[PDB]
């Protein structure tokens, strides 16, 4: 009789309870999180809408329910299709392609899908992030990048305490929420650039995150409940393998993707850079056209490094000027040649293949494995 | 009358009180930490439910 | 009762819901922020007017709704007109004008507009800020400036947690509110003068802001919703290039 | 452990004024003596009021 008194549609509350219950209904939910959710919902019902603790509880519970619990993307396991996709998206990097095909084969033979760490160390402008994206799309697992360079606040990995209003969880929980699956392709960039300064030491958090047995029970300070990271396929990138911590260096297989000789760079530019920048500039093959000799000249006189990004800048510049010459300029179409090249990009920069070609007495050439 | 035995008879804070009391009930808790927790709960009940200090006290209590 | 029949009925008395509904009706709003706004309106309705929390909720809702959402300010595209404008308000500076014409041409060829990042570096008193203003005038996109030099705290870029007494959003939020556009022309001044000291390192926020892909979902501490910034055109001015961060 | 509290107790007994002791060690919140405005739910007066109420006098030995 006490209960049956002025129901008045229950004041429109407790609908969030059913909403969260149906949201979790599709997921395979562990017992720990399930009991936490039940107790949290009981407290929420006990509370009123205005209370700040109620708002914090709602935020935490929304974060928890938005997590993919037992939800795994339909991973691609066909090897020929993945190989074709990788070859159609990037050139060379045969070791990475073989490693990914071998990973696919073991996962298929191993039943369920798994993920292990493997770092792509090599000079910049080589295609590590791009190949990470290619792997993500070919293998069908979602993608998400993460810049750890120069980072000192470990809260980016381990989140906040969830108590201080406005506190946010670790970036990995954000990635899990966005991707909507427990088998993404996470990428950590600039691992070697960590400073781990005052109040930092995020390398310990990284060790806890990548350790194949500890990571399975990884938890952030915000969402104290642990999560399973035995299937995440992490990727790490660094131009040098020395400054990276030893405990983290020895915890992954380091794959080298290094350098692109003139012929290799020319092939890459002909088949992958020019079309990409052309589509970026809203152009077509007929209107804007470059000759292989022009690309060779750009490589050999306007760009001197193992990477490729500078060649990307030069090709983008020439395509931009072609677009200007097309929209307002007299020329409806462009046929770029070295003779014309002088006006598209300017006079050559690197006029000398070397400091000199005589090597006078007392001086000798040598080779250096610098960071870039 | 309805609030009796239901609703907001806890006032958004006695829920925390009872939850932590039951959480620590099974534990064989020392007396020092027992009185510290009692004092912390008294302070929490002495503070509002919408302030930064209240939230920090809740963090320490958890 | 007579007042309800004839008077203020549904005007500023719990009708702020409808006021903001019509205010945002023009905007092409996303859906995530739509459910967020619906939740905030439910809270405000369930919150008593007198309570300070109700007033803070109204303040936050005003801040959110005041931001444009899908409001693409019309962009000038006639290349000859913009060329004449640039040659009218500034002498020489051929490289900058050529780059701006290239940007206009690619935007026209793409159809929809887009915004990229580019820095004008040179001696002071040369016309970098003035030509940024001229570019805004010709392209017709609004203009706003931001002096990041000698600055340590990231708060003025990413505001505050909204819980601190009188917490405020980032200066970019103020710029978005003032411009009434989603694709304005932000100008970063004295980029090479950042201190990036203790509790600072705003270069991280700058990189997150200028990232060609992460910029599309930038968000601050005060407001926790992504904002698209792939069409905004940034301009950075610095007397030298060596001291600017390499990642930036 | 020198008996200063015992000295105060003996002084109170010899003076015939009621005895009470206050702990100000490490305190930061003046509310323990200033209480709280009583408008907030659960607000409690300071400790001097408790001393006056328990001693039953306006001339105790604080
Ligand atoms: N083998 C390749 N095939 C296609 N593109 C490449 C190749 N190598 C480099 N690139 C280009 O260079 C760019 C490098 O991207 P970036 O994020 O710098 O990765 P990394 O830091 O590994 O170089 C990519 O946009 C990519 O298009
Ligand atoms: N080429 C130019 N044409 C017209 N005015 C110029 C030119 N160069 C410099 N100025 C003038 O000099 C002043 C320099 O101020 P400003 O451009 O804000 O400095 P900075 O370029 O260092 O930001 C401007 O007010 C501008 O009118
Ligand atoms: N001069 C003294 N003569 C007798 N007993 C003493 C004397 N000084 C201290 N005490 C003993 O010390 C005890 C109280 O110590 P306490 O007041 O706690 O020390 P403190 O004043 O440093 O806090 C009493 O039981 C008392 O018997």
Numbering used by the authors:
A (entry chain C): 402 to 773
B (entry chain E): 402 to 463
C (entry chain D): 402 to 649
D (entry chain F): 526 to 587
Authors' own words:
Other hLon mutants were produced by exchanging Tyr186 and Tyr394 for glutamates (Y186E; Y394E), thereby mimicking the negative charge introduced by phosphorylation (hereafter “phosphorylation-mimicking” hLon variants), or for phenylalanines (Y186F; Y394F), which acted as non-phosphorylatable controls (these mutations were introduced to verify that the effects of phosphorylation were not due to the loss of functionality occasioned by the removal of the Tyr hydroxyl group). When Tyr186 and Tyr394 were exchanged for glutamates (Y186E; Y394E), the digestion of β-casein was visibly slower, particularly for Y394E, where almost one third of the protein substrate still remained after 15 min. The phospho-mimicking Y394E variant showed a slight decrease in TFAM digestion when compared to the wild-type or the Y394F control. Cryo-EM maps were obtained for Y186E, Y186F, pCMF186, Y394E, and Y394F with resolutions ranging from 2.9 to 8.5 Å (based on the 0.143 cut-off of the Fourier shell correlation curve). Y394E forms the same lock-washer structure as these other structures and has roughly the same twist (50–55°) and rise (8.0 Å as measured by us for all structures) as the previously reported structures together with a gap around 23° wide between two of the subunits. ADP could be clearly resolved in the Y394E, Y186E, and Y394F structures. A Y394E substitution would not obstruct this channel but might change the dynamics of the Lon-substrate interaction, thereby slowing passage.
One of them, ATP-dependent protease Lon, is a member of the AAA+ family (ATPase associated with various cellular activities) and is responsible for selective degradation of unfolded, oxidatively damaged, and short-lived regulatory proteins, which prevents their toxic aggregation.
